[PDB]
Design a protein around this ligand. Sequence first.
Ligand SMILES: Nc1nc2c(ncn2[C@@H]2O[C@H](COP(=O)(O)OP(=O)(O)O)[C@@H](O)[C@H]2O)c(=O)[nH]1
Ligand SMILES: [Mg+2]
Ligand SMILES: [Mg+2]
Length: 167
Amino acid sequence: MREYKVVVLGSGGVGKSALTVQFVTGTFIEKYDPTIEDFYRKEIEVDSSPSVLEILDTAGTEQFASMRDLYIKNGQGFILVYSLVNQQSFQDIKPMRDQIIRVKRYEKVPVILVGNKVDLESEREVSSSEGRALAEEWGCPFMETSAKSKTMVDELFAEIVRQMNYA
Ligand SMILES: Nc1nc2c(ncn2[C@@H]2O[C@H](COP(=O)(O)OP(=O)(O)O)[C@@H](O)[C@H]2O)c(=O)[nH]1
Ligand SMILES: [Mg+2]
Ligand SMILES: [Mg+2]
C-alpha cells in the first residue's frame, strides 16, 4: 500500500486539528486541547489511484525547538497552516518552513502553504497576494481553506500527495 506520512504544522489556534478532523470525519469541530498529538490513517484516491495517508496532528503551540525537529525528521510531506484572520500566525509560519529545509538538508521537501479560516473573511488580516507571494518564493502550492468545507480539505490532502510524488 503506498503510505504517505504527512505532518500538519502551524501556530496554536490556526485550525490544524479542525482541518485534519474535517478530512477524516467530514465534520467541523468547535475546540480541542492544543497539547495533544494524534495520528490518523485514512485512505484517499488522488487522480483515481488509491493512497493511504498517515496524518500527524501536532501539539504546535510554541513547542521546544528539538520537539519540532523530531516531527520534521520523521515526516515525509508537510502542511504549513496559518490563519488568515491572525497575521501573527502568518509571521510565525516563516521560521517553521526554514527549519524544515535545514533539518531535512539532504532532501527536496514537499510542502504546501495554507491560509485557513477563509469563512471569516470580514476579519481578514493577511491578503491572498501575501500568502501567494511567500509560496512563490518557496516554490510550493498555496491554498486558502475553511475547515468548514469538506471539498476544500479534500483538495488540500490530495495536493500534498501529488507534491510527495513529484519531489
Ligand atoms: N471559523 C472557523 N473556525 C475555525 C476554522 N478552523 C478552525 N477553526 C476554529 O478555531 C479554533 C482552533 O482550531 P484548532 O483546529 O483547534 O487549532 P490548532 O490549535 O491549530 O489545532 C477552534 O475553535 C476551531 O473550531 C475555520 O476554517 N473557520
Ligand atoms: Mg490542534
Ligand atoms: Mg488521541
